Amino acid sequence: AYFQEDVPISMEEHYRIRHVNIYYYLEDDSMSVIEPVVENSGIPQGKLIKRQRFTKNDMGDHYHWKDLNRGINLTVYGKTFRIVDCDRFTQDFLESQGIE
Amino acid sequence: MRECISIHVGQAGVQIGNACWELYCLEHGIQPDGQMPSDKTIGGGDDSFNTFFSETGAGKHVPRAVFVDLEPTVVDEVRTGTYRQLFHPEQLITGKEDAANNYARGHYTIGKEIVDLVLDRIRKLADLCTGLQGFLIFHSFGGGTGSGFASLLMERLSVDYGKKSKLEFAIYPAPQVSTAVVEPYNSILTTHTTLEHSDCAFMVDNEAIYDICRRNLDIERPTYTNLNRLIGQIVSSITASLRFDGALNVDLTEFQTNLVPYPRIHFPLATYAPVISAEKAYHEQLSVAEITNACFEPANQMVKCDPRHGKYMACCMLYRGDVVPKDVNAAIATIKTKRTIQFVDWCPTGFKVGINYQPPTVVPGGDLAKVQRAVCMLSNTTAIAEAWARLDHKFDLMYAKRAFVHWYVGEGMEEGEFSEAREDLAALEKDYEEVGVD
Amino acid sequence: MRECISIHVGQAGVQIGNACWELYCLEHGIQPDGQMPSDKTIGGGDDSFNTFFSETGAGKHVPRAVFVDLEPTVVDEVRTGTYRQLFHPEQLITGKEDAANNYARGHYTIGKEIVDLVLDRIRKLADLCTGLQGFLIFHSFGGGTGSGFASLLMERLSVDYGKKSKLEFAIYPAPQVSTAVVEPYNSILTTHTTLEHSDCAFMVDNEAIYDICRRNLDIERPTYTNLNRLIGQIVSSITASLRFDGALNVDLTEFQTNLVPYPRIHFPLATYAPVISAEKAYHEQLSVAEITNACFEPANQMVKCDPRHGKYMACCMLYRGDVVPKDVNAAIATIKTKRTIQFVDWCPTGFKVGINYQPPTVVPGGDLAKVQRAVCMLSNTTAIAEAWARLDHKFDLMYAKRAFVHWYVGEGMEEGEFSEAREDLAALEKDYEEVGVD
Amino acid sequence: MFKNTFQSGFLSILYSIGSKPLQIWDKKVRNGHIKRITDNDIQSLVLEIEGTNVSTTYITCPADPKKTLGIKLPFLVMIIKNLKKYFTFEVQVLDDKNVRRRFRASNYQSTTRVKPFICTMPMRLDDGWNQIQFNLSDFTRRAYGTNYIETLRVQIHANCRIRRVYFSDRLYSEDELPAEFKLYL
Amino acid sequence: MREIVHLQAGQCGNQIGAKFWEVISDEHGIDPTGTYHGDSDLQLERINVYYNEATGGKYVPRAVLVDLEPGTMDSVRSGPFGQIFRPDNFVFGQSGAGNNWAKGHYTEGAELVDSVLDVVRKEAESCDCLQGFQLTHSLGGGTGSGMGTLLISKIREEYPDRIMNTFSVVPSPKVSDTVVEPYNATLSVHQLVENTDETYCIDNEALYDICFRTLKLTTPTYGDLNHLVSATMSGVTTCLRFPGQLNADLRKLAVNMVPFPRLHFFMPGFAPLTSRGSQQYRALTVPELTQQMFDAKNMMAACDPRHGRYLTVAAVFRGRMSMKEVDEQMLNVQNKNSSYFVEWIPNNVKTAVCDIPPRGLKMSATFIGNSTAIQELFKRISEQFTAMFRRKAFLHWYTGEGMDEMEFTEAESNMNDLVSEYQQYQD
Amino acid sequence: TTFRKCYERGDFPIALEHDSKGNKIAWKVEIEKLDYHHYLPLFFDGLSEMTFPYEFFARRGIHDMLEHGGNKILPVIPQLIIPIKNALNLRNRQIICVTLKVLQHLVVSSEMVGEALLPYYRQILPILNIFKNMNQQKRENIGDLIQETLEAFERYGGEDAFINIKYMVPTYESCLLN
Amino acid sequence: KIPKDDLDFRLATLYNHHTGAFKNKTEILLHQETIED
Ligand SMILES: Nc1nc2c(ncn2[C@@H]2O[C@H](COP(=O)(O)OP(=O)(O)OP(=O)(O)O)[C@@H](O)[C@H]2O)c(=O)[nH]1
Ligand SMILES: Nc1nc2c(ncn2[C@@H]2O[C@H](COP(=O)(O)OP(=O)(O)OP(=O)(O)O)[C@@H](O)[C@H]2O)c(=O)[nH]1
């Protein structure tokens, strides 16, 4: 996945786009977002949102793996994210589960 | 940051060592090739392995340990094993000559020309490390090569680096089983040399480890594949705080401070409560209550000692898995209400808790159960002095009839150094009851 | 809450408890594997099973019983049966040596080294239980292993836990049929040991059990499968109050307080009225009135005692199914007006009614009828001393000619304790006639 | 112990002139001997204590470990003949803070190690009936920086030939020492 | 790496070494031609402990054959593996021994020691770092005792830092055939006890009984006795060549075996010996292995330790076992006869586990022991010396050679001291 | 009390002169040459020691050393607080009556006394703050001794010692500028 | 009297963990006059 942000002051640009990575724990439906760590970056990298269940709507529902297709936009406590693609076992399992 | 270096002297200490990285590579999913799948965890070497392995931009997890051995037998076939590509060739420090169980032979004859090479390894490992809290020394008191070679190096690493921790782990000599009558000689030589330099030493005994196997694991014929797994899960549990986190995180420095009361005696006892077969845990339930009873059940200890013949000073419990403080603090409170459990009156509180949410996992081709709640129990009691009491009446018989001394004095020792240990030991026992005397 | 622990001692007692537990899995729909379908009933173990099974987070119903036996044959075959995966391996307490029908051999020679282990079971079940009203002991007087081994343990369970109930169920010895001539020996040994510790002991006799089969069930060739089925129904009926509810709910404590008049004698008789063949149930009708007469019909008792030579003290009717107070209270009122029914004048009322709405279900592959209105008839009378009077004139003969004594004095016993049993029985019978004397 | 007795002057606890002096000297005989031979240069009975191992056989005060010593004096002089063997001894005392401590002196010792409970000291000396001098107050302040209070128990090991054991408060000269204390060759 | 060079001396040792070497080749699977048929990777790696390399994959044995009679060496040269032994290694003399110790110790040895030392130093420089050497010979054998006593002495000062194994067979107690044989024995053993550390004690009469006990086939060949004993010496050498968690160094072993220097004489012990039907009538279990391992009948060396007590015992196990069964078996035997050990040392057991079974069977073991049963050995020789030194029988020859009674005096005196030494240590 | 047995054991050379209904004490060894560091705080534990005749030794020596050991208490002050503080915790009027009389001579014994006591004010003032008025024939009134201590202490205390007492003692008045 | 397993094992075992070696459950838990002695 990826996310954007806007520069309010600095010399160079108006906006900053940043790539992230989405991790869905299948065992307990906990989730974690880890940005890749890059050098000379001028931003702190590492763990953005620790392992937990992401509240989907306001009742307290959680983003369950049934409702995750490609190219889906989702909000995680403010920032809205966008799904890019998947990795080998993911589509295999998800098409085994059946998500077109 | 939070890292350490592990040391393995003696061919006894290497196959047991091999197991834990065989264990350690699984929970990180490390493939035998040396790299992850297409998933991204590589970089400058900073992830769950950074505390254990060194997976630089080259992408190969380099474990932070050195395997030293004096015989090329056990080191070569493992150099032809499965993960040997992961292993750095010359941190598998091989040797061409043995110590013949002789403490001093591995301490004087050949150790001189080899440790300097080992010193090169540790400094070239020291420079790359950042925090390096301490070291994980794996050895054996009854070491044909583990005993003597370790003694000189632990001296040399003490003198150059006396500012960091040194963690010692060795198989305690079997009290009534003796595969070598030379063992009491070299072992007491280690103890008297190590008592004033070792930071925290820990002992285990295989007999009760075997006794556990056919008690609850119900295996009448295990192997070290099982044994190295059982000790490997013990060191994995204590290192989970470095790997993962939980309600609170605990570190070896707090372990040292809160476990050892006074200098010299720094020799606690470990125990793992959820030791059970797969099918037993299958249709039974694990909870803090019974495992607390099991961890404090006297026969569950792998060290041959009756706690009622001694008295408790410290008890460290490290709960790995999904637990809550409510039952735990209630459960330990009930333990404090127990009357047979006789802590020394000097310490009102003697409980050191470390909570980690991560469940302990199974091993491929394994024998263990499916643990959701585990605890590693680290305790020290005065019921241990009988072991040294066993050794001295063992040792004193031989020394009067000075058996095998011609072997030692044949290659360059005298009587005094052997004299030293006995009152050093006699000091140890005499210190043990006076602290026991309230 | 409302739970109890079943005890099954003796390879006589093993199939029946198995049959009872087999019955119990049906009415709850328990699959032989140990789990329900995708329907949600699992948890920490709190539902209709929480009183009988232990279906923890693992999801496997663990029955709250321990099967103890001295010969491995029958206990291993059930360990190879259909529900063995449900059963706990060392709850199936096995033995390797028999008592050879000797009460003392199973009470002295081997019971010592086994009672500690089975105690480890009962104590380890104690923690998981919460209310644990009492126990369900299944045994036999002429126990080749049931008699002696139970006697030691009931003594041990009496002394440690004297604050709760203990329910005893044993096949009463066949009056005129003797499968063992030593059976009178161990039987009387059980009685005098149990008179001062047992809470409520209930007896049953196999001969009349067969007599029912070819009278109304129309079976001239039944088997234990049938025999164990009906007694399994008996205990199922009395335990339905724990399982389900009704117009009123009653408990063994109320049973104890109201059934036993005075200390010592606590030996009433059970009876189940709607025992009938399917065809006789088919083109006839069942209702409270006739089953009340049938349950009070003297030949419907499975004990060879005719009430008209005794007198009634206590009578309990436990109606499981669709009943209303109106016909029940009116019908019993007619029974009180009956003249042949000779209650003792000491008790104006001796009626304890238990109403349960749940219909008694049939078992697949069974032989019973489909009962809408059931009743288990618990009653005590003075026509029971006939059985003991049968035993003594039997016993007084052999003891004078002291047959087989060389066996018992051979393995370490004497005659004084055999001497005690005779006046104890003489005491019991004279109490029976004295309370018979108004 | 016998603190009710007066610490003034000398405190001769062991002395071989007595027929049976072993009352408070508990002996742990182990592959050695207990023998009373006469001498040549002092031509008197002495305490022959020898054994195959030093730690195996050793004489101690008090006879009963449960009871203390109770001695004020900070000096001590031991009469011993150099037997050309492995002789050692130890003393366990009490300091100001009431933490107990031992002073283990051994002839073979190559170094001097201080443990918060036990101090290991070397003994090198000459041949013949050589003598002993130690200021207990000195070692406490030098080693632990503490203040000496009381003797609690003293243990004497094997490979030795003893004539008399006595304490002192100062460095008493040979003058006030009586004739039996004025040892003559 | 650490290697061993073998010495083959004496006319029996000529038959000894031939069987010992062929077993190794068959164990390692080399053809008689010398072209190894690659079948086991482990035996391929740990064969350089004994063999060096020749061109064409031929494994040259690092052994030396020495004798005086051409016929015997020609016979072994014509054996199934004579082609694998080197004519370079065939050193000999132009004389018949006369089966005389002094001639083989002073007269004929003088002009042959120069060559053999020039020989052995060549292979010594050929190899890298020896553990030591082993010598197959006999104590009652004339040429072997004469040569070996000379050689062991000279190689003492040459390399006093190596594993100096000696292998000798005790002549038949009932009949020695050679009648000057005890004279040869005392002369040999005098230097032997001075110049050996390891010495194996083997007797033929026990072997004949062992045939009567387990072989049960009436008429063996002496090669079958060679077959039996060569299997025994192979077992102790299996430790070095084979992997598995067992410490192989004889120095690892000898220091565990030698509490005091004058203990040099050691007895073998072997594992399952099977009769004609019992190959398929035996349940191969460690208990019955250990039972048969510790059988006074399974003893083959000299005589029954039942007369005395047990000083040191060391069993090496070869096959697929575990430490636990030997552990409980050790407790069983420890609890079996605790008093029959010496109170001098408890826990006198030293065990090694070779995970690689032999070729032909799975469960196996070799036992090396030290009990107080050698007193019979040198007391039975004692009265022979006194009886024949009573009247100097067969003595004019040795005086003609240049010997006299004086050496015999300390020769028996040395032996008599050993009598008390074994006696005092136990009794 | 460790000190009580110390001269039950007997190492301190002190005698006394003899009497029927009063008090007077004598000596054996001159104090000025004996010790003011190793024996000083030990004997102040005697003030914490209240048992006849061992109590008779207590006050005598403490006052007597003051007139004969003036300018030697300076480097010993921190150790001397402990016997005082323990006596404070003792909670008995007769003991406290003794202490203040002792402290009265202590404060005016020599120079620098209160000036050296500046770090050690908040260990004695608190419990005296709470004694202020808890209560001529024999100088019995505790409250009078309390103000006597405070007055001489503040005038000799210096510049802020007074307001330090005022901080501790909220009733406290001045004896210098009011 | 006795509440639970840990005390049950501990109060009556007659098993010296230092002395007892390669023992079995029955041999491990061994009570006293509780049974008969
Ligand atoms: N740590 C460990 N010990 C073992 C293992 N198997 C057996 N042991 C025991 O560990 C001891 C090994 O110690 P040593 O023989 O002194 O080992 P060493 O110092 O490296 O020298 P060696 O004699 O060559 O083995 C033996 O006495 C065995 O009782 C094992 O797999 N790991
Ligand atoms: N409870 C019960 N009793 C049975 C059953 N089948 C037969 N019996 C009767 O119960 C008696 C069994 O008693 P015992 O032989 O002493 O049983 P035990 O004490 O467990 O020991 P065993 O001799 O091995 O059977 C027999 O004499 C039968 O008459 C049965 O299935 N259940």
Ligand SMILES: Nc1nc2c(ncn2[C@@H]2O[C@H](COP(=O)(O)OP(=O)(O)OP(=O)(O)O)[C@@H](O)[C@H]2O)c(=O)[nH]1
């Ligand atoms: N080869 C062989 N030797 C045997 C046999 N039986 C007994 N021996 C003895 O083994 C001894 C050792 O042989 P060598 O050391 O080579 O003997 P030697 O030096 O030539 O002098 P001799 O003993 O006279 O033969 C001989 O003395 C034989 O008596 C046998 O069956 N085969």
